[PDB]
């Protein structure tokens, strides 16, 4: 439901809150969430 990114091979995937925390293709134990889809605005100051 929510995307994730591996910490070594930078491979995108998704998890269903029941899979083991692991990259599907290289088996790394550290993954990162992906950026939000909301709008990000800055004041340029």
């Amino acid at each position: 439901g929510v995307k994730y990114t591996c910490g070594a091979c930078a491979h995108n995937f998704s998890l269903n809150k029941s899979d083991p925390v692991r990259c599907k293709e290289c088996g790394h134990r550290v993954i990162y969430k992906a950026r939000t889809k909301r709008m990000i605005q800055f004041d340029a100051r």
Binding site: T5, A10, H11, Y32
Partner: protein, 67 residues
């Protein structure tokens, strides 16, 4: 980290002179002569290019986090 756009003290735009400065230094020109050739008169501007340390060339050596 990367060359500032404007000189802090007065506000002259020095962000477009980093590549030219490196090119001039490559040809053997001295630092003072290189800064003079870029028309940087005030020493407030000269310290911006003279004392800049380029750290982004070290941050770029790390493998990008996405693909």
């Amino acid at each position: 980290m990367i060359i500032p756009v404007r000189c802090f003290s007065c506000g002259k735009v020095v962000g477009d002179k980093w590549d030219a400065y490196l090119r001039l230094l490559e040809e053997g020109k001295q630092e003072g002569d290189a800064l003079d050739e870029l028309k940087l008169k005030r020493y407030c501007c000269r310290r911006m290019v003279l004392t800049h340390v380029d750290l982004i060339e070290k941050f770029l050596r790390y493998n990008p986090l996405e693909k």
